[PDB]
């Protein structure tokens, strides 16, 4: 822990969360710009938050170009400072900043590709992210996108056992979570990336539900109400209801009209109902969609 709050000069606040507030700071000796996430152990009513215990322990071993790097942990008795590498913006603000311009297909492609590398790396190191959404993906000026906020992440075993329910921000939540399945796996992260893919194209959320059931219904109206054929077991699932409306699956070219043959192929496989058939981050790296992928810088500035 070779770090001291005395070599940092606060610059501005760049975010906030349950944990607390994030500031951009500058290392006065090396010049390095960092994000400082402050956890107020001050509220030690129960000690060090489990969310922070998971975030720190899991990020300490997740070293990958597309996962935000934990640089240091400064550990007063009063406070706890997580020093993260500094990235300029998050994907949601960029999508807003890209309002009526669109995000260029090369950049969507590049971003999806990098997101898949980082998630594959998580999965290969027994870590589920469980809150992939645009607000939690950080971009730099150099064309990098990195998974961040591991506050809800979780070290899984093989095979998985039952973990916390109603995880993932609702808009990005996989159907097997919405249907209260006993077990969920790496597939839930893939689902999230699928939503984000579609969202990078349209700049609008794909399934913006206002409730668990409205969420399911939004999903079902787009991909079709699942049955024993498309998804064996579904009808047995704890929160499956036989009275669910049976919506026909609409043609996939209509879900995301600007998307090409390869794009649609990939999207459909990210959004397969059955977690067992849904594509892995690792297999998805090889999809033809990426044949011509490059890494361009973001077209706009911070």
């Amino acid at each position: 822990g070779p770090g001291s709050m005395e070599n940092f000069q606060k610059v501005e606040k760049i975010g906030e969360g349950t944990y607390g507030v994030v500031y951009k700071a500058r290392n006065k000796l090396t010049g390095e710009v960092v994000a400082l996430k402050k956890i107020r152990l001050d509220t030690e009513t129960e000690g060090v938050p489990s969310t922070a215990i998971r975030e720190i322990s899991l990020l300490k071993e997740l070293n990958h170009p597309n996962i935000v790097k934990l640089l240091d942990v400064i550990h007063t008795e009063n406070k706890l400072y997580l020093v993260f590498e500094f990235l300029h913006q998050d994907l949601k603000k960029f999508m807003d900043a890209s309002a009526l311009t669109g995000i260029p297909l090369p950049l969507i492609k590049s971003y999806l590709f990098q997101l898949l590398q980082g998630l594959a790396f998580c999965h290969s190191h027994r870590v589920l992210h469980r809150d992939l959404k645009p607000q939690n993906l950080l971009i730099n000026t150099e064309g990098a996108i990195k998974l961040a906020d591991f506050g809800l992440a979780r070290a899984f075993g093989v095979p998985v056992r039952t973990y916390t329910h109603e995880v993932v921000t609702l808009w990005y939540r996989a159907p097997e979570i919405l249907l209260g399945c006993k077990y969920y796996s790496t597939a839930v992260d893939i689902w999230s990336l699928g939503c984000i893919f579609a969202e990078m194209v349209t700049r609008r959320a794909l399934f913006p539900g206002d409730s668990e059931i409205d969420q399911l219904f939004r999903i079902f109206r787009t991909l079709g109400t699942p049955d024993e054929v498309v998804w064996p077991g579904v009808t047995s699932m704890p929160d499956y209801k036989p009275s669910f409306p049976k919506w026909a699956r609409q043609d996939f070219s209509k879900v995301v009209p600007p998307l090409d043959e390869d794009g649609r192929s990939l999207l459909s496989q990210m959004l397969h109902y059955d977690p067992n058939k849904r594509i892995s981050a690792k297999a998805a790296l090889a999809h033809p969609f990426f044949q011509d992928v490059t890494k361009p810088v973001p077209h706009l500035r911070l």
Binding site: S50, I53, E61, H125, V158, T186
Partner: protein, 262 residues
């Protein structure tokens, strides 16, 4: 089989094997422990088994907590009157990591019989974190066992529960078990369990996965076989009691085999 992460199971295995060497305690730490013994450790761990039953915690949590204690005690010298405070903070941290619903801190103070205060437990929580440098995602015997379990033809609950049980018995006795890695005890335990229940042996397929053979497992197997035979007589009994429960198929009631023909 997404619950069994087909695309990542080997990556994960390979990764855990690396990590278990980094998260390993010093085999000979109790000698450099002036004021505590293997016997006191056995008492502490046996207690932690009861706490886990009391609060209906995962078995993974118990394994994590033991891992934390043995690494702390590998670098931090502890008086006998403080051994429990280490153990309680270990269990708290392990719960915050592994449990959906950790017991509240107050509950941890309670199970220590107000030996310690809520301040002491919290202050120790920080100390353990500083000593471990937050490195809490440690491979446990269980995380190995569950993978080995996929190699049964077919799955057998008695085999699984008994493997768990044997592996848990190993946590109690720093001597000899500190000298063996989680992946090796799990392999010993799996074969012992399999043999005992079905007469079967370490499968070829697990030789492929792990590189371990009954040849390389032999030392640990000989130890585990003894621990199994002498378990009714061991001063600590909480694991046997626990593994009477139907939850674990009453495996502690099964009779160990007299020889291993190994």
């Amino acid at each position: 089989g997404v619950n069994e992460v087909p695309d990542y199971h080997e990556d994960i295995h390979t990764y855990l094997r690396e990590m278990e060497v980094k998260c390993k305690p010093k085999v000979g730490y109790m000698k450099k422990q002036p004021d505590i013994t293997n016997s006191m450790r056995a008492i502490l761990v046996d207690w932690l088994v009861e706490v886990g039953e009391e609060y209906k915690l995962q078995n993974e949590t118990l394994h994590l907590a033991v891992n934390y204690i043995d690494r702390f005690l590998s670098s931090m010298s502890v008086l006998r009157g403080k051994l429990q405070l280490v153990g309680t903070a270990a269990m708290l941290l392990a719960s915050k990591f592994e449990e959906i619903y950790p017991p509240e801190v107050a509950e941890f103070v309670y199970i220590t019989d107000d030996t310690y205060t809520k301040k002491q437990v919290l202050r120790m929580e920080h100390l353990v974190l500083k000593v471990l440098a937050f490195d809490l995602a440690a491979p446990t015997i269980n995380q190995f066992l569950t993978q080995y379990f996929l190699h049964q033809q077919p799955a057998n609950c008695k085999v699984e529960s008994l493997a768990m049980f044997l592996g848990e018995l190993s946590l109690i006795d720093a001597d000899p078990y500190l000298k063996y890695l989680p992946s090796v005890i799990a392999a010993a335990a799996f074969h012992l369990a399999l043999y005992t229940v079905t007469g079967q042996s370490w499968p070829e397929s697990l030789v492929q996965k792990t590189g371990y053979t009954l040849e390389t497992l032999k030392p640990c197997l000989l130890d585990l076989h003894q621990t199994y035979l002498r378990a009714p007589q061991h001063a600590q009994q909480s694991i046997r009691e626990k593994y009477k429960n139907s939850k674990y198929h009453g495996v502690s009631l099964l009779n160990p085999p007299e020889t291993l023909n190994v």
